[PDB]
Write a protein that binds this DNA or RNA. Sequence first.
RNA 1: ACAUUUAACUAAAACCCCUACGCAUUUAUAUAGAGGAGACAAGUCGUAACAUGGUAAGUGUACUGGAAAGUGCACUUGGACGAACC
RNA 2: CCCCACUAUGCUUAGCCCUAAACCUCAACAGUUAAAUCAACAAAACUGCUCGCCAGAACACUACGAGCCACAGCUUAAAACUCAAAG
RNA 3: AUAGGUUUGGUCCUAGCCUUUCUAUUAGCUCUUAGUAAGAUUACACAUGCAAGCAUCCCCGUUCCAGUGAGUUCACCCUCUAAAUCACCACGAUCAAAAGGGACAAGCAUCAAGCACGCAGCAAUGCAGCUCAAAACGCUUAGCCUAGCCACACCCCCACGGGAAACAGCAGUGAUUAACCUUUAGCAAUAAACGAAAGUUUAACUAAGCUAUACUAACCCCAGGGUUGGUCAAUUUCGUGCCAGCCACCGCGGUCACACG
Lengths: 168, 215, 43, 51, 110, 108
Amino acid sequence: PMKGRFPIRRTLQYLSQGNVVFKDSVKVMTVNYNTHGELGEGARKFVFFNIPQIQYKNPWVQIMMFKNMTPSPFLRFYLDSGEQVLVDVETKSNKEIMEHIRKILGKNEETLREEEEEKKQLSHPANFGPRKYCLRECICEVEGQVPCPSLVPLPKEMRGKYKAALKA
Amino acid sequence: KKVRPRLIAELARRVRALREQLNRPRDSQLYAVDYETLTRPFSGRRLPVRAWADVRRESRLLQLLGRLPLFGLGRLVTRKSWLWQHDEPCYWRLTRVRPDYTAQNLDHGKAWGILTFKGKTESEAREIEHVMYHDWRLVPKHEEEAFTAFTPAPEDSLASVPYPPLLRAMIIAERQKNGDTSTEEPMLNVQRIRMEPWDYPAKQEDKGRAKGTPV
Amino acid sequence: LYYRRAHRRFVTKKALCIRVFQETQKLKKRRRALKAAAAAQKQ
Amino acid sequence: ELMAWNQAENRRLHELRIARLRQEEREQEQRQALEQARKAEEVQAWAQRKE
Amino acid sequence: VRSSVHARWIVGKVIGTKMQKTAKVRVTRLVLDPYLLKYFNKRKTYFAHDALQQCTVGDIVLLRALPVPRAKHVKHELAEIVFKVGKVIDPVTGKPCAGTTYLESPLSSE
Amino acid sequence: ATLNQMHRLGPPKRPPRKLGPTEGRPQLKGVVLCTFTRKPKKPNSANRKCCRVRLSTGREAVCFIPGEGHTLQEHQIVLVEGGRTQDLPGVKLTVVRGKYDCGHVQKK
RNA sequence: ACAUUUAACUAAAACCCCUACGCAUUUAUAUAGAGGAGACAAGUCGUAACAUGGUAAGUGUACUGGAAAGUGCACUUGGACGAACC
RNA sequence: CCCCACUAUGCUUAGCCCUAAACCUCAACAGUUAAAUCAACAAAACUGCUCGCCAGAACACUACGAGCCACAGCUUAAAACUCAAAG
RNA sequence: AUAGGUUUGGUCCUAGCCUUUCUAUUAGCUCUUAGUAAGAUUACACAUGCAAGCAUCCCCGUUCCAGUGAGUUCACCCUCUAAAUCACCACGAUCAAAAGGGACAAGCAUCAAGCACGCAGCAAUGCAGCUCAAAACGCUUAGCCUAGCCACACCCCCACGGGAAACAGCAGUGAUUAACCUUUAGCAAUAAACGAAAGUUUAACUAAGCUAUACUAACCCCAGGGUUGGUCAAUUUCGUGCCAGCCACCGCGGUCACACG
Ligand SMILES: NC(=O)c1ccc[n+]([C@@H]2O[C@H](COP(=O)([O-])OP(=O)(O)OC[C@H]3O[C@@H](n4cnc5c(N)ncnc54)[C@H](O)[C@@H]3O)[C@@H](O)[C@H]2O)c1
Ligand SMILES: [K+]
Ligand SMILES: [K+]
Ligand SMILES: [K+]
Ligand SMILES: [K+]
Ligand SMILES: [K+]
Ligand SMILES: [K+]
Ligand SMILES: [K+]
Ligand SMILES: [K+]
Ligand SMILES: [K+]
Ligand SMILES: [K+]
Ligand SMILES: [K+]
Ligand SMILES: [Mg+2]
Ligand SMILES: [Mg+2]
Ligand SMILES: [Mg+2]
Ligand SMILES: [Mg+2]
Ligand SMILES: [Mg+2]
Ligand SMILES: [Mg+2]
Ligand SMILES: [Mg+2]
Ligand SMILES: [Mg+2]
Ligand SMILES: [Mg+2]
Ligand SMILES: [Mg+2]
Ligand SMILES: [Mg+2]
Ligand SMILES: [Mg+2]
Ligand SMILES: [Mg+2]
Ligand SMILES: [Mg+2]
Ligand SMILES: [Mg+2]
Ligand SMILES: [Mg+2]
Ligand SMILES: [Mg+2]
Ligand SMILES: [Mg+2]
Ligand SMILES: [Mg+2]
Ligand SMILES: [Mg+2]
Ligand SMILES: [Mg+2]
Ligand SMILES: [Mg+2]
Ligand SMILES: [Mg+2]
Ligand SMILES: [Mg+2]
Ligand SMILES: [Mg+2]
Ligand SMILES: [Mg+2]
Ligand SMILES: [Mg+2]
């Protein structure tokens, strides 16, 4: 079987289920958490389960984690303007910590929808070319248009070999 | 990532640029012509067939100015190609002339002046082009007043042209879609576009020059 | 930072490399005074 | 607005922390008192042995 | 405001203070292993101009990108010392803490 | 191995594929040097007709001549192909019948 | 190593250096000669191993011998000791 | 191989050498005995976590390179040809 | 992989090898037609012809297209800002160099240390640092991430200067390799260059020639190649007698061979 406890975390499906896409301001995220104590279980679960999902959706945001430096767990976000957002996460569950940062620093669902629609316009249905980029390679594929000579040979009158023979 | 320097590529580049400045050919060599074969001996290239006639019959600009006190400063010089084409007086008022001293007859060089194309005088003097062409003609002093006599015709010209069929239909549809109800015809303002003739003197300052390779 | 044995060849080479650097540094400075002297003469 | 809301949440959590810390000291003081009593008896009994 | 330096804000651990007015900072980023789909730390060294030479080895620092690199390798400056080595003040409560224990109780100043 | 170890080692380094006697080429031309016979290994017994050729690459190799009856002589040109003679240990080349000087086996 | 000139009633002219490479430095191919390894139907000498293999086998190390191998010292069981008393 | 004699050596002091079937051939730490216990044999079968190591046999405790108080040494350690097995 | 054959007297486990599938080159044998696609082994040497002109002279273009894969993290993103197009001073847009930052192949650690690889200061000058087992420094191999891109253009990385006299443009030839297309036509289409233009030029390109390398569709005539012990679809009778020969693996042939001819 797959190695490690909770191997689901090492699957593209699980890594793409994160709902936190930070706004462009967020640059660094420092996760200070304690390895022991009941009040820090959520922070430990948040580091175990959710940091992979956050990093996958925000590849260019630096996530750095510090163990047992302070009596209580907290998050700190460093924004491009220079503002620092301290989020105390003590007593909160890993689900609550995740929802809290989506609200204050996550792009809303409308902002994300728009970006996806802008991507749709990059591929034009009418454009012809290689299959990697376009739906159809040649107009000959469109029914009604003169088929490809490779499939349906053209009439002798339309072929240059015999066009110049009739003339000369 | 540290690119290995190419020193010989920079040395030769500097040497070439220098030699191009010290061994540069003069206008006497570049713009010479053999009047029998009608080929520039510098490059051995034939002139176009349409220029053969004027090359034999007409004089260059500094073939005429070399016979004047100060290379014809403040003197009007026209061109045959202009006289044949345009009725309005087209001429240069010469302001500066850099003669080519290497010519045995001082029949090459440069020239600056103020353009007056079709009776419209330019505000500033600029370098004259086609100085090497067999096309120029000197305006006699006693004929200057009559030659320059011009009456500006009325400038009445078309100001607005209709949009082409399709574009017109697309501008009218946007009006109706936005809600604006109007029956005015969309038209292109062509007043800004001042269409100059194809034989209008270009800017000689931005024109290039033939390279040094002699034949 | 690193835990690698310094065998004879390495120890000997590192001594020369330091000596060569020191002898080059001194040369860099003898091509500073000579240039300064020539510049002073032009005046 | 979201940053102001986050700061308000942090302040609320801090008020809860102070309450929890106050209770823990009360329990600490109690445990300390018992330890000190036990220790004092041990020292006394041990001091008597050496005398 | 525009800077030619790619990394604009980076947190790192000071690992060297032997250059004059320059702190050598190790910055670690989480990188996905494409085969294992597990995140492993990748570390990079950054030189950060420290005007006051106030950085100590082992302290966590915040580096702001300089508008243009002042030296061949110095492209950042020390913006802030997030955690001083051995003298950490709890951001949540603002009290001095040694490890996971408060040196000054948060209840001292109420 | 652990996940850290697998990450530190990376993907398996494919052991480099070994080029056989033809050096990754379908056929090689050669010049016959001598013609001799070789006795197979156990449990077989025969006098298998072999030749030594100098290949176009310059290497000299022993090549089995297949079929019943050959006319190959020294200084003749032959095309060789892969395919080991399972009896003869170390004979990894075979002369192609019907090419250059090596002719097709004569019917019965 | 190498120099600021001529000209200036429009303005231009002039501008051009020598030093390396050697049978040295690098990596291979070919070999007088000297040796290994593997393969290989039916050669010669002995019998070291597999049974307590006829001195149980083997490890490290040392010395010795045509050859397998022998012996010393320590170690291993991947040997056994016949499994109530006699 | 058996008998006898007698050396190096076994001992002490001071320096080396750095090997073993150095194997209880069963890694350190933490935990479990529930279920399909479980190829075979051996010393029942497993979970978490981490480091080390292994990818057909033979060549090969070898060659070369490198390091070492080692100089008939030790450590690291291949390739060509061969085989369809070895275990 | 839905797997299969093969270690042994036999069983189980482990393991390598090989079989069956799909493509590309070359060889043997064989081969009817049409359409289409594709097409030196070699950065070795090349006979001959052609491949860049245009145009009232100046300019512009010949820096493109086409070719090749020798070398090889110059290709991507960001920052900044030339040249170029938008007639023109604008304008900003578009496009895209140099410069700065970041990112980016494979194998070898028996390549383990590199040897100046750093920082500070206006400078003078001071400090002694900088990279590296999380792989520095090196050696070896290779064009790449294919609407295309990068690099090269006889060699000396470059090309002032040397060796020297150049098809890695098209057609073609010599040598070489297992590897083998015509020394056709036309600028009519599109593209490029030039002209204000009618137009001119182009071995780009277009339309043909050659070739079972491939796809597609035919054929009244006309079928060959391999295989036939097991894996694996399928052998009758003779000759041979561990000989001659055969085999991808296991194997066959010693006088009744479904394995050789
Ligand atoms: N080579 C170093 O000096 C070094 C430095 C930092 C960390 N490490 C760590 O050491 C481990 C082994 O690395 P490798 O495979 O490159 O070494 P390795 O075993 O191949 O030996 C190469 C070199 O690293 C040294 N080394 C070996 N094990 C080490 C260890 N645990 N710690 C430090 N040095 C060690 C050896 O002395 C040798 O000089 C890894 O976990 C690595 O992160 C090594
Ligand atoms: K036999
Ligand atoms: K046999
Ligand atoms: K024995
Ligand atoms: K035994
Ligand atoms: K043991
Ligand atoms: K198998
Ligand atoms: K064929
Ligand atoms: K032109
Ligand atoms: K290449
Ligand atoms: K080159
Ligand atoms: K055309
Ligand atoms: Mg065969
Ligand atoms: Mg020899
Ligand atoms: Mg015996
Ligand atoms: Mg015995
Ligand atoms: Mg013994
Ligand atoms: Mg021994
Ligand atoms: Mg003896
Ligand atoms: Mg036994
Ligand atoms: Mg004694
Ligand atoms: Mg022991
Ligand atoms: Mg062991
Ligand atoms: Mg351990
Ligand atoms: Mg040993
Ligand atoms: Mg050895
Ligand atoms: Mg050695
Ligand atoms: Mg511009
Ligand atoms: Mg660039
Ligand atoms: Mg290592
Ligand atoms: Mg070696
Ligand atoms: Mg290459
Ligand atoms: Mg050539
Ligand atoms: Mg060149
Ligand atoms: Mg050609
Ligand atoms: Mg071919
Ligand atoms: Mg064709
Ligand atoms: Mg028979
Ligand atoms: Mg048969």
